Amino acid sequence: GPLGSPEFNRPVKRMIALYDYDPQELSPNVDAEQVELCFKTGEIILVYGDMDEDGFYMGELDGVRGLVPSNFLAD
Amino acid sequence: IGRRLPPTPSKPSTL
């Protein structure tokens, strides 16, 4: 809860992609091509902070940064 | 217009 000392918390996590994702083929979002990251099964995404209220993580992959759908990654 | 997740894949991962 809110009371007590801060706990250890990793601001960066590595997450394995379990499914291919090309926003142009699969995203329902009007701004997908601008803001979402493309990736392939087996690639690992570095994820920064928490998922947003829509379910996306801010991720990095091979020099490119963008939002990634949490439901395509291994939790 | 809000953002939402794509539909979740239903087939087992090929990984």
Side-chain angles (χ1 to χ4, degrees), chain A residues 18-19 41, chain B residues 9-15:
Chain A
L18 294 178
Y19 302 92
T41 301
Chain B
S10 68
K11 298 190 190 182
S13 173
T14 64
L15 187 64

PDB file of all heavy atoms in Angstrom, chain A residues 18-19 41, chain B residues 9-15:
ATOM      1  N   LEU A  18       5.846 -13.058 -28.817  1.00  0.00           N
ATOM      2  CA  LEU A  18       5.331 -14.396 -29.089  1.00  0.00           C
ATOM      3  C   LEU A  18       4.634 -14.525 -30.435  1.00  0.00           C
ATOM      4  O   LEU A  18       4.359 -15.640 -30.900  1.00  0.00           O
ATOM      5  CB  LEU A  18       4.346 -14.810 -27.975  1.00  0.00           C
ATOM      6  CG  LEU A  18       5.022 -14.971 -26.609  1.00  0.00           C
ATOM      7  CD1 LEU A  18       3.980 -15.339 -25.549  1.00  0.00           C
ATOM      8  CD2 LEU A  18       6.114 -16.050 -26.656  1.00  0.00           C
ATOM      9  N   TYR A  19       4.360 -13.380 -31.065  1.00  0.00           N
ATOM     10  CA  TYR A  19       3.633 -13.325 -32.327  1.00  0.00           C
ATOM     11  C   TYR A  19       4.162 -12.173 -33.165  1.00  0.00           C
ATOM     12  O   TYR A  19       4.592 -11.158 -32.599  1.00  0.00           O
ATOM     13  CB  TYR A  19       2.127 -13.118 -32.081  1.00  0.00           C
ATOM     14  CG  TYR A  19       1.537 -14.210 -31.227  1.00  0.00           C
ATOM     15  CD1 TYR A  19       1.469 -14.079 -29.848  1.00  0.00           C
ATOM     16  CD2 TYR A  19       1.081 -15.398 -31.802  1.00  0.00           C
ATOM     17  CE1 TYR A  19       0.948 -15.109 -29.055  1.00  0.00           C
ATOM     18  CE2 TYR A  19       0.549 -16.441 -31.003  1.00  0.00           C
ATOM     19  CZ  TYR A  19       0.486 -16.273 -29.640  1.00  0.00           C
ATOM     20  OH  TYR A  19      -0.022 -17.267 -28.821  1.00  0.00           O
ATOM     21  N   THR A  41       8.076 -12.641 -34.061  1.00  0.00           N
ATOM     22  CA  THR A  41       8.163 -13.666 -33.027  1.00  0.00           C
ATOM     23  C   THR A  41       9.612 -13.978 -32.639  1.00  0.00           C
ATOM     24  O   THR A  41      10.450 -14.159 -33.510  1.00  0.00           O
ATOM     25  CB  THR A  41       7.508 -14.941 -33.522  1.00  0.00           C
ATOM     26  OG1 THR A  41       6.144 -14.669 -33.844  1.00  0.00           O
ATOM     27  CG2 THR A  41       7.585 -16.077 -32.461  1.00  0.00           C
TER      28      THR A  41
ATOM     29  N   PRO B   9      -3.870 -12.946 -30.297  1.00  0.00           N
ATOM     30  CA  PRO B   9      -3.742 -14.163 -31.096  1.00  0.00           C
ATOM     31  C   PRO B   9      -4.272 -15.364 -30.323  1.00  0.00           C
ATOM     32  O   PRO B   9      -4.178 -15.411 -29.096  1.00  0.00           O
ATOM     33  CB  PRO B   9      -2.232 -14.266 -31.345  1.00  0.00           C
ATOM     34  CG  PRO B   9      -1.787 -12.823 -31.305  1.00  0.00           C
ATOM     35  CD  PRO B   9      -2.575 -12.252 -30.157  1.00  0.00           C
ATOM     36  N   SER B  10      -4.869 -16.300 -31.037  1.00  0.00           N
ATOM     37  CA  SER B  10      -5.468 -17.465 -30.372  1.00  0.00           C
ATOM     38  C   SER B  10      -4.694 -18.765 -30.635  1.00  0.00           C
ATOM     39  O   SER B  10      -4.873 -19.763 -29.906  1.00  0.00           O
ATOM     40  CB  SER B  10      -6.923 -17.617 -30.820  1.00  0.00           C
ATOM     41  OG  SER B  10      -6.972 -17.980 -32.177  1.00  0.00           O
ATOM     42  N   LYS B  11      -3.855 -18.773 -31.669  1.00  0.00           N
ATOM     43  CA  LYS B  11      -3.029 -19.945 -31.971  1.00  0.00           C
ATOM     44  C   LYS B  11      -1.820 -19.986 -31.051  1.00  0.00           C
ATOM     45  O   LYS B  11      -1.304 -18.928 -30.691  1.00  0.00           O
ATOM     46  CB  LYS B  11      -2.536 -19.919 -33.424  1.00  0.00           C
ATOM     47  CG  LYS B  11      -3.612 -19.965 -34.492  1.00  0.00           C
ATOM     48  CD  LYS B  11      -2.993 -20.183 -35.868  1.00  0.00           C
ATOM     49  CE  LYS B  11      -4.012 -20.002 -36.988  1.00  0.00           C
ATOM     50  NZ  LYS B  11      -3.415 -20.264 -38.335  1.00  0.00           N
ATOM     51  N   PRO B  12      -1.337 -21.194 -30.709  1.00  0.00           N
ATOM     52  CA  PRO B  12      -0.089 -21.294 -29.933  1.00  0.00           C
ATOM     53  C   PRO B  12       1.065 -20.556 -30.631  1.00  0.00           C
ATOM     54  O   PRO B  12       1.156 -20.534 -31.862  1.00  0.00           O
ATOM     55  CB  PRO B  12       0.174 -22.803 -29.884  1.00  0.00           C
ATOM     56  CG  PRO B  12      -1.197 -23.430 -30.028  1.00  0.00           C
ATOM     57  CD  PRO B  12      -1.928 -22.522 -30.972  1.00  0.00           C
ATOM     58  N   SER B  13       1.939 -19.955 -29.839  1.00  0.00           N
ATOM     59  CA  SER B  13       3.090 -19.252 -30.410  1.00  0.00           C
ATOM     60  C   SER B  13       4.020 -20.189 -31.178  1.00  0.00           C
ATOM     61  O   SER B  13       4.321 -21.277 -30.704  1.00  0.00           O
ATOM     62  CB  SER B  13       3.877 -18.570 -29.297  1.00  0.00           C
ATOM     63  OG  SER B  13       5.069 -18.028 -29.818  1.00  0.00           O
ATOM     64  N   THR B  14       4.532 -19.750 -32.327  1.00  0.00           N
ATOM     65  CA  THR B  14       5.462 -20.585 -33.067  1.00  0.00           C
ATOM     66  C   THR B  14       6.855 -20.601 -32.421  1.00  0.00           C
ATOM     67  O   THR B  14       7.722 -21.369 -32.835  1.00  0.00           O
ATOM     68  CB  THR B  14       5.591 -20.132 -34.529  1.00  0.00           C
ATOM     69  OG1 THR B  14       6.150 -18.819 -34.554  1.00  0.00           O
ATOM     70  CG2 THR B  14       4.234 -20.124 -35.225  1.00  0.00           C
ATOM     71  N   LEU B  15       7.064 -19.774 -31.395  1.00  0.00           N
ATOM     72  CA  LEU B  15       8.331 -19.797 -30.661  1.00  0.00           C
ATOM     73  C   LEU B  15       8.525 -21.112 -29.919  1.00  0.00           C
ATOM     74  O   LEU B  15       9.646 -21.623 -29.821  1.00  0.00           O
ATOM     75  CB  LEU B  15       8.396 -18.659 -29.658  1.00  0.00           C
ATOM     76  CG  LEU B  15       9.763 -18.501 -28.968  1.00  0.00           C
ATOM     77  CD1 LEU B  15      10.833 -18.144 -29.990  1.00  0.00           C
ATOM     78  CD2 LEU B  15       9.640 -17.441 -27.913  1.00  0.00           C
TER      79      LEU B  15
END
